[PDB]
Amino acid sequence: TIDMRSAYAWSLASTPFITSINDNTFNANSNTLEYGFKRAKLSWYTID
Amino acid sequence: DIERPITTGVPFLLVAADARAAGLGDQGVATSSDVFSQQWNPAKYAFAEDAQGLSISYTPYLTDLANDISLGQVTYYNKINDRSAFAGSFRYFGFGGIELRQTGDPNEPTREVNPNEFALDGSYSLKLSETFSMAVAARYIRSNLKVATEEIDASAAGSFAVDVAGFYQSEEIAYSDFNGRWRAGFNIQNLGPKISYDHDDLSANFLPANLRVGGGFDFIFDDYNKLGVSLELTKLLVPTPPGPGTPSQSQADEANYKKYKDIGWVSGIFKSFGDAPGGFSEELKEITYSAAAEYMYQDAFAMRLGYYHESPMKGAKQFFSLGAGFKYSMIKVDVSYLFSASKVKNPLENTLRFSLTFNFGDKYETY
Amino acid sequence: SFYVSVKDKTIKLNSTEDVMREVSIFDISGKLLYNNKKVENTEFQVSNFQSGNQVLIVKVTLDNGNIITKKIVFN
């Protein structure tokens, strides 16, 4: 196995496509500020 | 193989830390008094012939694989009177310095860690009668094996424990073909609060509370040749964790582990005598025993042979031991070797123990 | 001359000038966790190995036959 749960190894993701490259569910295809409009708050961490 | 082993914290405390006792099948509770008589029976420090002594012992681990992985012990005793003695010891298990080299640059400043476990104890032994002595020991245990990472808390876990020991040594009694001497001893060890490795009361491990009882007899020939035969019995004072079940499927196991882990160490001592569905015959199965023989020539040469037998269901650490001792003027040198007779590999296989003790001061007559 | 580094569950072996022939990685119990008879490099990366058990012993057999032992912490 290759461990993938190191919190510091993860960073904020780019906006994803959901079905294909022509899908715009989260505005991944837009070239304006709308590209980030569907990004909600997400926190990733390992409790100290 | 090993079924339902007894889980205790800091198991390094049970390892024989001196070559003399290791050569006698990891037993010292009823042998002759020596400088290493702190792990086994502090009560016989009051029977020491020399006024004071200092010893250094080396027990390496994984010798073929790496160096500097060893269990080291330094003991000092000093009997001020002919009836009382003060002793202190320092057992230390460490892997040596380990370099935490993250990048590949040769000159990058590297953090070095030395994961280790040590126990510092001091004992006072008082000779009540001319043939009987008792001792009380206080031990501080510190475990620092964890290495700090971004997630791992490497804070050292510590605990305290007390030992109560007694030693009996009869006078030289004459027989038909020889004039022997009888020895006996007991040592209740590691009596203290649970050690919390993760600094949480909900997850605490029993200290390796242990009861050693033993008897020894010395065959004396020609006032210069001595043969000593000793037997030791050992039982952990920690309750056995449940196995199959004793109230769904995993719910019963979880409840049993809940009940087992919610036991105080004082209560665990008494739950050790039992906590099983079997009778006396099946609870004697948890008793570790060890037999040893020691031949002494001019009190300056010793040949040591011993057999150690744990239950195959608990640990299954059984082996034969050979030891030799040499005393030049005040320097005694002890070496021991282990021949394993068990299915499970013994980490001390193919390992030569070394002990070196310095005796100095006045001489006390033996009774 | 010989360096062992661990960055993220990966072990990097750097033996300058000399060529490593074999690497064996041991947990501290005598247990072999990884062995590679076919390294043949002055730098080797154990990327197909991951244990997480902290202290490891790396033993490297050089082409000359010399054996280099390094103790590491598997971060």
Next chain:
Amino acid sequence: LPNGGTTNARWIQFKIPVSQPQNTIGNITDFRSIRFMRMFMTGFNSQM
């Protein structure tokens, strides 16, 4: 529990076969160059 009470818990194991994707985005046909891994959460109405 640290507060002295008790609670239930349910650990769920997932095994997602890499060779059987639900969808393909862009022009990728093999698994010989997998350079990034992204996970994102969606569809939830409240804090999760």
Next chain:
Amino acid sequence: TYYPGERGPYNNNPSFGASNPSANFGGIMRALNSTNFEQGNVEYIQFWVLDPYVGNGESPATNAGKIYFNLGEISEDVLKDGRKQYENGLGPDQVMVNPQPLWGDVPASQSLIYAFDTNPDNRKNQDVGLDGLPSSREGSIYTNYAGEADPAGDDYTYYLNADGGVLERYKNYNGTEGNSAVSINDPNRGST
């Protein structure tokens, strides 16, 4: 910990509270050390997750959703402008992209080493998040939230420097602005 109803970093949606929180996303990505899955014979993604609908702090049963996983080549352009942000190249004396590229300041120089110097003033000028703005010029770009203290929503807060429960103390732990304070004794301790 996912807050679908709370604005993510660099989100300038004028009507975010009026939108359905189920239509939002929150995601993280990561680089892989071994990229040849075929040679390595990578077979599946395995994980153990606590059921979030069972225990004490259980989620309401109506709070259903999906977790997606992506493997392959994924855009590293988090703030998509065609340009690579790197905050160790920012600063008042540094050259910026001559027209500001739609998310804030981007250094015009070629990056060499991904590292800060240890000067506190340079750190304060540089550790301003992925948008390249020190929270005082963010309102110019993120106009719909210019009245807030952190218009871009990227400010970092140390978990011991915040208040509330464990989850609340980590809510801003992933902020890219102010997460690299020079002093480890800083009240807002870095985390990187």
